[PDB]
Paper text:
The extended family of ATPases related to the yeast Snf2 protein acts to alter DNA-protein interactions. At the heart of all these proteins are paired domains capable of rearranging during the ATP hydrolysis cycle to create a ratchet like motion along DNA in single base increments. The yeast Chd1 protein is a member of this protein family and acts to organise nucleosomes over coding regions. Chd1 enzyme engages nucleosomes in a conformation in which the SANT and SLIDE domains bind linker DNA, while the ATPase domains engage DNA at super helical location (SHL) 2.
As Chd1 binds to one side of the nucleosome, no steric clashes are anticipated should a second Chd1 bind linker DNA on the opposite side of the nucleosome. To investigate this further, complexes consisting of two Chd1 molecules bound to one nucleosome were prepared using nucleosomal DNA with symmetrical linkers of 14 base pairs and the images processed as indicated. Most particles were assigned to 2D classes in which two bound Chd1 molecules are discernible, though one is often more dominant likely as a result of the projections of the dominant orientations observed. All 3D classes have two bound Chd1 molecules and the best refined class provides an envelope with 11 Å resolution (FSC 0.143). Two Chd1 molecules bound in the same mode observed in the 1:1 complex can be docked into this volume. There are no direct contacts between the two Chd1 proteins suggesting that the two bound enzymes are likely to function independently. Our envelope shows that both DNA-binding domains can bind to linker DNA simultaneously and that the extent of DNA unwrapping is similar on both sides of the nucleosome. We do however observe that within some 3D classes the path of the unwrapped DNA is less clear on one side of the nucleosome. This could relate to differences in the dynamic interactions of Chd1 with DNA on the two sides of the nucleosome. Even in the case of a nucleosome bound by two Chd1 molecules the lateral surfaces of the nucleosome are accessible for binding by other factors.
Author numbering:
A (entry chain E): 39 to 135
B (entry chain F): 11 to 102
C (entry chain H): 29 to 121
D (entry chain G): 14 to 118
E (entry chain C): 16 to 118
F (entry chain D): 28 to 122
G (entry chain B): 20 to 102
H (entry chain A): 38 to 134
Write the structure that this text describes.
């Protein structure tokens, strides 16, 4: 496999693409919601899927984010996603001010 | 500096400490950037939090306009629909 | 033949709150447009919900939630209040 | 009182809005105090917007109110322009706002 | 009878009912139930097959979620029609950005 | 029992029409009905909108016809109309 | 006479003023041409939506009213001139 | 003899031009252009003078907004002048196209 410099960097990427499993765990996420959902109302219940569905939404939501972030990052002469790279992306999409 | 019948119970499923950091990087590479800043990924969850509330806000509302205790997944869909992120696959 | 406007309803309330003040003819038109759009997003909202759980009625609560969702917080909650008081006002009378 | 609006204490047209809810196909049955509720609501909103519109007009040395006066009035308030964020303005015009860094040393 | 007289694969006496119960206009034009079944079938067919192609591209007997988006996401046209409608267990196209090369 | 009807019979023959001994998952099947029902409201709602703009009170085929044209891009749109126009045209021929 | 040499009408200065309105400070030579292309893209699609209704209406003299609904479709609602 | 230092004039106007409402595009050329394409679907059709303005406003504002997104991205890079890509970059991210 050639040498070692930036060897995995592109490798993991590819394997992750071929797959289609959830990027983030499905146990911490499950409480995260239960916990905030309480603050806006009491005595809450949850459909098995409802979360499954959120996970799907969210994950997908972030990737998408990163996907631009990357571009921005490239624009900059950089291969590094940065704390702001996040902001511009959002700002111009418009949720971020 | 005592044993003092000490009992230790702290909270790491729901709370953001508990969740897994690789769980994110897992996410980061699908996009395929080479590098992750420490600062950055903390912000990213930050936003996740912002996105997550608004939906549930609505979700909760539809659960409650019908006087229902069980929150429907459809309920989430419409929510997503309102922001223009509607999900095919679910709940026609 | 009968061009409608909501100019009449703006016209009173204007004076009720800023009586040494007036409206541009186009500024009023803009407002006419605004209300109707505003009338429709809500009405639209209302209708969808009726249908969702098969409700052959837009009651006084179906509108209420509708607004709650449609509107950003500070504005939404005051409006919720004015709403019930009015029902309060009108039914006994 | 005869006029409905007055029985509910308002300026907004009770019955004109009722008919508009039947000529818009929105549904098979029209509610009885819906109409009012709704009328009254907008009433507030109008006010809400029209309350500062005037204040803006005061701001700039005029006794009347031209449309920009509606525009600035809506953009500054976060709970105002937030909803209308999808509304663009007959000759809206612009908030003076110059980005941080291109301003000069 | 409907499919027959019309000559389509889609249900002509099903969308007529919903369009009158949705409550679109006052009455309903005779034009539509029939016409409305037709384009729908046409779209139905346009995806199945490219989905088929996509499954055969990577050599598979059965088509599954992953395939469908692969089909559409790659296609120029469908992709725009369903530009922001987002998708069940879907994952994504292989993409490698330029200056991220392993030289 | 329960209802929860769907377009499963229509999507299935279409796929048969385009690769007969080719298969599908039970997960892509709902995506499909979700997709159809979604396009359904998109088109029929717009028809409703025009009808009560230029001042009339029923929705015919012409309107869909118009609607479709601006709802979709150049090349698909024409073929789509064509198909649409004929199917019905034949329908009337019979009667 | 088919209207052409149109695209230019929107000369150097006017494209520029927009941008100042935008809050851009300065501008390279190249993009005067790029934007015209888009402007055209945008007009085409809207007018495309607008024209159909007008045809739908058995008329030629396409109304301001259509301009707008057509704008409401693409998703650029306008407050000001309509209904 | 005197000539203003670079960047002293441009800002001054920005604002002047920001305060006002009045349209920037020309009444005649605009009109001709609108006629040019409309003919290309169907030839020789008419519009109320206002109908033309209705159209004129919706796009004049539309650019000014995009130019604003173009500028942030110019800034993000440590740059100073809105370059081409930025516009395109912007176009791609908004994912209108």
């Amino acid at each position: 496999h050639r040498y070692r410099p930036g060897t995995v960097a592109l490798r993991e990427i590819r394997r992750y693409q071929k797959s289609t499993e959830l990027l983030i765990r499905k146990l911490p996420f499950q409480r995260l919601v239960r916990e905030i959902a309480q603050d806006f109302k009491t005595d809450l219940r949850f459909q098995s899927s409802a979360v499954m569905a959120l996970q799907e939404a969210s994950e997908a939501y972030l990737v998408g984010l990163f996907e631009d972030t990357n571009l921005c990052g490239i624009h900059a002469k950089r291969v590094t996603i940065m704390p702001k790279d996040i902001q511009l992306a959002r700002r111009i999409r418009g949720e971020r001010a | 500096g005592k044993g003092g019948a000490k009992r230790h119970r702290k909270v790491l499923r729901d709370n953001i400490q508990g969740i897994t950091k690789p769980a994110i990087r897992r996410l980061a590479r699908r996009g395929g950037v080479k590098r992750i800043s420490g600062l950055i990924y903390e912000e990213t969850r930050g936003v996740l939090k912002v996105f997550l509330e608004n939906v549930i806000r609505d979700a909760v509302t539809y659960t409650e306009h019908a006087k229902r205790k069980t929150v429907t997944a459809m309920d989430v869909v419409y929510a997503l629909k309102r922001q223009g992120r509607t999900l095919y696959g679910f709940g026609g | 033949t009968r061009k409608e406007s909501y100019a009449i309803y703006v016209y009173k309330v204007l004076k009720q709150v800023h009586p040494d003040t007036g409206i541009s003819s186009k500024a009023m038109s803009i407002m006419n447009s605004f209300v109707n759009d505003v009338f429709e997003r809500i009405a639209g909202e209302a209708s969808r919900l009726a249908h969702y759980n098969k409700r052959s009625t837009i009651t006084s609560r179906e509108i209420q939630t509708a607004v709650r969702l449609l509107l950003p917080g500070e504005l939404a909650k005051h409006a919720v209040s004015e709403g019930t008081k009015a029902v309060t006002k009108y039914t006994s009378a | 009182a005869k006029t409905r609006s007055s029985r509910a204490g308002l300026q907004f047209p009770v019955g004109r809005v009722h008919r508009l809810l039947r000529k818009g196909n929105y549904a098979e049955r029209v509610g009885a105090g819906a109409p009012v509720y709704l009328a009254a609501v907008l009433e507030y909103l109008t006010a809400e917007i029209l309350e500062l519109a005037g204040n803006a007009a005061r701001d700039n040395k005029k006794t009347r109110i031209i449309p920009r006066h509606l525009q600035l009035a809506v953009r500054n308030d976060e709970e105002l322009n937030k909803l209308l964020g999808r509304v663009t303005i007959a000759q809206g015009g612009v908030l003076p706002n110059i980005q941080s860094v291109l301003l000069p040393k």
